[PDB]
Each structure stands twice: as C-alpha cells, then as structure tokens.
Symmetry: C3
Subunit: 277 residues, 3 copies
C-alpha cells in the first residue's frame, strides 16, 4: 500500500504503509536504517492484544520512494501528518523507536494532539544529542556526526555491518537473543533503503527537540535499554525523563539499542501495560 | 503486475502475477515459503515447449500484499478464482507444488472444471496430513503442527534455515543438485514474505481434502519425490493415488521435497509428457 | 516510479526510474546484471556538481517488469526513447556503462541527437564483440557466447558468483577497492532480475554497432579500465577510439570492468571534466 506525500521532479513521493487488525489505532515509526517490518515482534503482540496496527516506511527506507529531498524532522512530521489525515485516525497511539521518536515529538509539538491518545518513546533521540555549551548533556560533538556521514558515503554496505554490531551488541547477543539470520534480514533491509537517504539521515539525529517536549500533552511512556551503545541512556532517556517527569519510564536492564528484537518481551509487556491503562 | 482480490482496512489485497508466452495456459501455484519465481526451471521448459505460463504469488508471499487475513484454502481458492476469471482463462492446466496442491483440489472441488483442461499435483498435501482416529495415514498429530507455528513465531529467519535443509535434503544435494547460491535466493525469498503469513500458513497444511478428491473430473498427474522429508510419500502421494486411481502417477526416486530445482529434469519430462497427451 | 514501454499478454511492461536533482539532465544506463542503483557513487557526485540525474532499470532488471520479450538493442533503444520523450528531456547527456553503451549507440544512430548534448561510453561493447572473418578484432567466437547462455540457464545464482569475481577482479580488489558487503549487494541485485532476461541478455552482447558509430554527432567520451577482464580493452575501447578519433578517451590504469565502484574517483573526475566542457 502507498500514501503520496509529495512530488520530486517528474515523480511523486510515496510512502509504503500497512494497516492491520481492528481496534484502537497504533502507529509504529521505525528506526534507521530499517523499515515498518522491523516492528514484527511488536505487531504480533498488538494484533493479539486487539489493536489496529499501522506501520509505514519513512521516505528513503524500506519500500517507500527514495527522493533526494525532505530529510529533516519537519518534513518527516508532515509526512506523518499526511498519513494520519489520509486514514482519518482518531484517538491514535504514536510509538516511535530511535529516529521515530523525533517524529512523535515534532508532530505533537507542531500539529497538536487532537487525533492522539498517547505516545511512547523507545530508544529515544530526545532531548538534543548535540553536545554544546548550552547542551552539556549532549552525547557527542558535531565532528562525531560529520564522521558517520563520511562513513556512510564511503561504503554504506560495509557501514551497515559495524552499525548492526553495536545496534545489537552482537558481541553479547548473537546466538542468544539474536540469530545470525535475523541480523542478515536487517542488513538486507538497510541495503534496500536509498543511497541518498542513508547519508542524509545521520544529519537529522542532532535536531534539538528541547522545545517540543513541553507540548507533549497526552500520557507518555519512555523506554530505554541500559546497554544502549547507539543512544547512551545517560544523554537521552535519563535527561528526557527529567524534561517530562510525568512520563512513565522503564529501563531495560542491559538491553542494547535493538531491544525490539533482543528484548521483544520486556518491550511488549511495558507497551501493552502502558496502552491498557 | 497485480490482481486485487480483496480489501483489508484502508488497503486493497493485491496478488503479484506474471503472464508469459502464448499457447495453452498453464497456471503454476507455488509452495511455502516461496513465490511464483520458484518455478523458473519449469517456466523456461514450458515456454520452450510453447505454452502460456501464468504464475502468481499467494497472499503473504513474494510480491503480493501481506494482509493478516484470509489464510485458509477457501480464500486461497477464491483468490485463484479471481485470477482465472480476471484473465478469462479457458482450457487451462493448473499445476500446484506442495501448498499449491491444496488450491488445485479446493478450486476444482468448489468451482468445477469449466475453465480447466488438466491438473497436476507435485509434492502434494493430499489427502489429509492430520493423523487422527479417522485418519490413520495422517502424517503427524496436531501437536506437531502447533510446533511449527511456535517455531516460526520464535524467529522465522532462523526457522527458514532448518526448513531449507530438509526441504532440499541439503545433507545429500548441496554442491551436487543445488548450489549454495540457489539456497541463498530461497532464504531471501522467504524472508521477504509477510511475518503474519509465515506463522499462519502452517495451520492450513492439515486441511482435509478428502471430499475434494471425488470432484476431480479432468485428467490428473500425481508426482512425488521418494526422498521427501517434508511430505512423506507414504502419507501423501501413496494414499492420494489410491483415492484417485485414475491419476497418472510418477515417483521421483530419491528426490527431496524441493524437486522443482534438484530434479528439474525428471520434473519437466513428466510434466511435458502429461501435458502433451 | 514507472514508465510503461509496452504490453506483454495481459500485463504492461513498466520500467522503474528515478529523477533527482535539478540542472542539465544526465541519463545513466546500467550494465548487466545490475540496476539504476549501481550508479550510486556517480549519482552523488553529479548531484553535488549540480545536474539532474535520471536512472532507469532496463526491462528484466532491478525493479522493472520481467517480460520474456524485447531483449535486443532496437527494443532497448526504443525503451530509452520512450523515457526521453516521456520526460521531454532536452539537451541531455547519455552515459552508458557496459550493456548501456549499446543503448547510447543505437539510440543516437536511429533517433538522432535533437534531445542530446553529449554521450559517454564506459566499459563499452563497441564496436562489435563477435570475432568473425570480417571482424578480426572481435573478442570471442560465437561458441563462447553460446557458452554463457548455457551457464546462466544451468544456475544463474551460482553463475553470478563467478561473474562478479571477474567483473570486479576480486582476486585483486576485495578488501581494498571493494568490500564483501558491496559485492553482496551486487549479487542480491542480480538474483532479483528476471530469470528469462538473465539468459537472454548475453545474446545482445555481440550486436554489431559498426554502423551506429558514424552517426555519433555530439561530443563523446570513451572510458575503459586497462584491467578489464569482462570487455578486453584491446577488442573494445581501443578499436572504438579508432572508429571515433574525435572521442575524448581515458584509460583507467588497472581498473577492472566494475570500475564504477572500485575507481569511482577516477570515474567521477573524467565524467565531471567531460561534462564541464
């Protein structure tokens, strides 16, 4: 299925989406460099629990179009907006994972919560990963991001490999929590995203969501893996919770970045309890 | 190419199909967890032999849509019906492989043979794989199927690997009858099917086709690999032939489940002789 | 995005294409058994340089339809024509790599250069790879091509593997100029092209472009890897340059066939200088 969000030269920009089950609508917003398909462990539990599950592939990823434009949180938020309005979702739950948590903050902040019942942030970017003078808690200096960009441009194929190692803590989880086949599928999904999007995505990672946070109006859930090597729990989740005290917060003991797969359980159990309420 | 068979929430359910060559129409119905593309060795021989070759991806597989509904032989048969009627196929040959043989029985049985000239069953499910009191010849107890479902839900990626081993008798055929690259392509195809369809398919495997058989009206071919580790020739092909004495029957000596690839020859030669008549 | 070029039985024949950037239009025509995506190193440099980049997947490859018809340079040239006319490209640069250089010669020759500003031939087929009495410089006897066809039909999966070895000079370049992940992506792309197209493509390789050459009207660039194991520089580039003295010509010292990736640099630098003029 596709939803058209714009135009690029002679072609339109279409997002691949899926719409399963019946019940209260839950929209899942994937992380880099994956696709809506990465939520399969969560989707099955929500379907069983009796929710309507909406997944979509961000522009440049999985089965969506691969323009060379619109790689920024406002565009991504506007893309989300079009999906919501296209489907006329009411009383929806927005769940973002990694990059997806930037969409959740930015949409709520700009568009408001009229269609939105609750939000959930898993392995969040928030509040601001750039380490500055004004942002002391930031996870890295600008030079560091500039780094990743350079690495993806040099050979994103080879890049994906080192990325998944840390994404999943493979030195700990391989053959235990994650099969080699599961990791194979992940690399294939990434290799399938647009070359341009691959190098342009890392630049959206240090977007400042500090002014988005106060706008979160509806009940929220913050969930982070304490073994997160990709988004240090101390520069993210921990400072985010201070910014939104109100958020229900769950720490997944020794879970890596890729906790959707390695700790699907602990993830499903927090998720379903938070949505139950 | 797509043919729309239904609607799921806000999206339609579309089946990916291909239509090649000219001549008498031959429709190929693939097995789990593959796609219309798995018939490539057979398609080339039919094309050379002068037939019109129609392939399609069952819902949840290859390039078709991945709903979370309709995983049962009546739906699958109705999906087939729509294809036949969409293309206005007349005097068609229906060839099913593994799961596909459930479509052939069920369509013939419910819809009749007005568009149908002949049928062929390769590595068949028939007549009833569930081992019961009334079905003594059944290949396994219910607990066994329940088993597979559980295994696919746990990590279908990793599952595909053990599956292909037995599917192809890789301990015997690897590097001989099947290349490692050929097996790689198979895993990629499966990893590409819908997560839901993967776990829901195994439940359609013990459908009782006992009352479908008497309805087969047109000339039939039954072909099985005697080294079939997936569908024991003794619980399937052998009891099916007793149920349809009339069927022309070919045993492929030491061929595994995956005989379309490992024994493409012996397969093409039986197929082309049966269609020639 | 798709552009429909024809009809095959009940289905249309659609070519997958991309249209990025703004500026003078540059159309990239990929080689066997790849797709428009193989130009990613070149596309990024052109985008940065300020060009409009058009890529498309030849029929039977990458994301285009997979008919069992039209595998010949006139059809391929007519396919190109439809793209050009569909987008109303004016003052376009046509860049072909390997197989793509057959499209560039054939289109220019038959349709003329009214929409065309310049052409570039990388790892070219020209002028005639068939070794005959009249074509002494030909790279191989007919028996040799017949060879490849037979090999692809036998197991194209396994075939791709040996192909990429020579395509990339992996014995020299692996772990240096090309990562194992980069090669993995290439095999996956090829495995994804149509089975029919795979075996039918090699027959278009010894098309005689000897009468096409005199028709090249606009400024041209000829670029070849001196370590080309796929298209011997001595039977191709070197005799082509004699046929078109006028062409600007660049030899890439010890570059294999797959120079777009291994020598992206030397490639981008020649390309951008030639387009700059």
């Amino acid at each position: 299925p596709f939803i058209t969000v714009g135009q690029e030269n002679s072609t339109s920009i279409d997002l691949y989406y899926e719409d399963h089950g019946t019940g209260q609508p839950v929209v899942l917003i994937h992380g880099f460099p994956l696709s809506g398909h990465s939520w399969e462990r969560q989707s099955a539990a929500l379907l069983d629990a009796g929710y309507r599950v909406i997944t979509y592939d961000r522009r440049g990823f999985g089965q969506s179009s691969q323009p060379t434009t619109g790689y920024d949180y406002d565009t991504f938020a506007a893309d989300l907006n079009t999906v919501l309005e296209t489907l006329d979702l009411q009383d929806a739950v927005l769940v973002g994972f990694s990059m997806g948590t930037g969409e959740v903050a930015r949409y709520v902040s700009s568009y408001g919560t009229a269609r939105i019942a609750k939000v959930a942030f898993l392995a969040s970017l928030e509040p601001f990963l750039l380490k500055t003078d004004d942002n002391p808690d930031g996870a890295a200096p600008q030079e560091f991001f500039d780094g990743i960009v350079a690495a993806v441009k040099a050979d994103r194929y080879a890049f994906y490999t080192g990325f998944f190692n840390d994404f999943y803590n493979l030195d700990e989880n391989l053959g235990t929590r994650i099969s080699e086949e599961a990791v194979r599928n992940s690399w294939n999904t990434a290799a399938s995203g647009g070359f341009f999007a691959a190098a342009a995505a890392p630049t959206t990672w240090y977007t400042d969501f500090r002014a988005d946070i106060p706008r979160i109006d509806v009940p929220a859930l913050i969930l982070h893996g304490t073994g997160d090597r990709t988004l240090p729990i101390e520069n993210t989740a921990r400072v985010f919770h201070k910014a939104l005290p109100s958020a229900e917060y769950v720490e997944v003991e020794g879970a890596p970045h890729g906790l959707l797969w390695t700790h699907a359980e602990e993830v499903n159990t927090a998720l379903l309890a938070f949505l139950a309420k």
